[PDB]
Amino acid sequence: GDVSLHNFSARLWEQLVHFHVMRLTDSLFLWVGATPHLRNLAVAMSSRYDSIPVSTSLLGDTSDTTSTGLAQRLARKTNKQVFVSYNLQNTDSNFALLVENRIKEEMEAFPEKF
Amino acid sequence: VSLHNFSARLWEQLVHFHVMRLTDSLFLWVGATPHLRNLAVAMSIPVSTSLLGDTSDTTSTGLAQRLARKTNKQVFVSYNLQNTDSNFALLVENRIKEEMEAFPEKF
Ligand SMILES: [Cl-]
Ligand SMILES: [Cl-]
Ligand SMILES: [Cl-]
Ligand code: NI
Ligand code: NI
DSSP states (O other): OOOEEEEEEEEETTEEEEEEEEEOSSEEEEEEEOSSOOOOEEEEEOOSSSSSOEEEETTSOOSOOHHHHHHHHHHHHHSSEEEEEEOOSOOOHHHHHHHHHHHHHHHHHOGGGO | OEEEEEEEEETTEEEEEEEEEOSSEEEEEEEOSSOOOOEEEEEOOOEEEESSSOOSOOHHHHHHHHHHHHHSSEEEEEEOOSOOOHHHHHHHHHHHHHHHHHOGGGO
């Protein structure tokens, strides 16, 4: 439930490799890549204190709330821990609404898949 | 672990979705199709599953499995480099393990 974050970097062969970590008690997320990088990966979980799930950007703080917002809203709806990896170029806010609506449609049609 | 994917025509793109359902957790991936497939999770030896569709590239499934072995927990690996040379991958794995030894409370 309690999230901690870490990052580190290393020169391996002739390239800078960048690592991000998210630690929960029973789960670990390891991300390997380059720096700089996009910060489009989030996790949210239902707090038992508030009705609003706490959403964290796993790849470093960002002011873009697309992934954190989606994760939070889906965690609210499903009552489980939700990771979102949002890999779309098009960050028009209306496009994101279309995407979110499509996800909700799938959840209505196939609740057992979520 | 249960996997699902779907696509939708939204404006002038296919938007592509991948879903992984565990009992406690859900992973949603949004992007384009076709796409890279280098995201895995391992849990219990630990068994590794590719979240983004079957692949012959074992970089992330291999890494996840090895780190899940070492840590005894569920481990996701997202491998975002082009270089999938197995010697390079071992260097990557070793660097992670060094960090785990130095800062065990961060893992
Ligand atoms: Cl470099
Ligand atoms: Cl089609
Ligand atoms: Cl293949
Ligand atoms: Ni970073
Ligand atoms: Ni796919």
